[PDB]
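Rotation project, supervised by the postdoc (A.L.). Task for the rotation student: set up a whole-complex structure prediction and record inputs and outputs verbatim in this book. Inputs entered:
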Amino acid sequence: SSRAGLQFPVGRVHRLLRKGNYSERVGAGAPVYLAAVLEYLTAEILELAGNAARDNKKTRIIPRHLQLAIRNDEELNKLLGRVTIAQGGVLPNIQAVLLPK
DNA sequence: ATCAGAATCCCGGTGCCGAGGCCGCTCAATTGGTCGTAGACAGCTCTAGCACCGCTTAAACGCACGTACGCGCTGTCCCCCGCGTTTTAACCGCCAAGGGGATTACACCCAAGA
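Outputs recorded:
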């Protein structure tokens, strides 16, 4: 992790890939790549959640912040389409035909 | 246009259990070395993909006319929209079923074992 400049563990990812019964041999660049991708995804999600929390005057990330960060982003909603977030709720979307005319 | 009215958001205020910081190891991560096979690279090939022509024809577009599905407007009465009353989902103290100490007054005498 220190040689690749990543916060996610490289040895743990390598051990998980070796014990997960995915392939006979595992290279040295695949765990680094997977850890980097996971770290980038986590960083994007956490930044969006922190922005949503700052928009609500909150200092702690709650599942509602994660839901608002995932649903507002198009790519994050496409990647997590069939993903359900517990205690996250939904978006405050009201149809125009239901408003008082 | 205009007001009275219940419903909603932000601020003193507070404290507490969840969020956050620190210590000891020890089992997983790291270093160093010896096998070693799956991976990278060069070579032959012919089959598979690609571009183009000859002859053919049913498919696709413009024309003609109305109409019936498409859609605005109307008469109705309906069954949800919404408030008032407890109640049903559980939460919270005294009866009449029994288990036990206590008694057979008071004072005196005789006989026979450890």
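Student's summary: Chain A has four helices and no strands.
Supervisor addendum: Residues 9, 11-12, 15, 24-25, 60 of chain A lie near DNA strand B (CB under 10 Å from a C1').
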